[PDB]
Every structure is written in C-alpha cells, then in structure tokens.
Amino acid sequence: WCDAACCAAAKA
Ligand SMILES: *Cc1cc(C*)cc(C*)c1
C-alpha cells in the first residue's frame, strides 16, 4: 500500500 500498485489500482 502507498506504492505503484496502490496508485495503479486507484487510477484504474
Ligand atoms: C498513500 C497512497 C499513495 C498512492 C499513490 C496510492 C495509494 C493507494 C495510497
């Protein structure tokens, strides 16, 4: 969390 996967999921 608060990583590139978190921000990719938030964007998607
Ligand atoms: C703290 C944080 C930052 C991003 C880019 C995304 C998430 C889910 C949390």
Deposited experimental method: NMR
Find out whether the beta carbon of 12 lies less than 6 Å from any atom of ligand 1.
no
Find out whether the beta carbon of 8 lies less than 6 Å from any atom of ligand 1.
no
What are the C-alpha distances in Å from 1 to residues 10, 11, 12?
A: 11, 14, 15
Protein residue with least CA distance to atom 6, ligand 1 = 7
Sort residue 3 into left (φ over 0), alpha (ψ -120 to 50) or beta.
Answer: beta
Structure tokens at 8: 């990719």
Task: For the chain, state the CA radius of gyration.
Answer: 5
Query: Residue 7: in which H helix or E strand, if any?
Result: helix 4-11
Find out whether the beta carbon of 4 lies less than 6 Å from any atom of ligand 1.
no
Structure tokens at 7: 């921000």
DSSP letter for 3, please: S
How far separated are the first and last CA of the chain, in Å rounded? 15
CA distance 12 to 9: 5
Query: Residue 2: in which H helix or E strand, if any?
Result: none
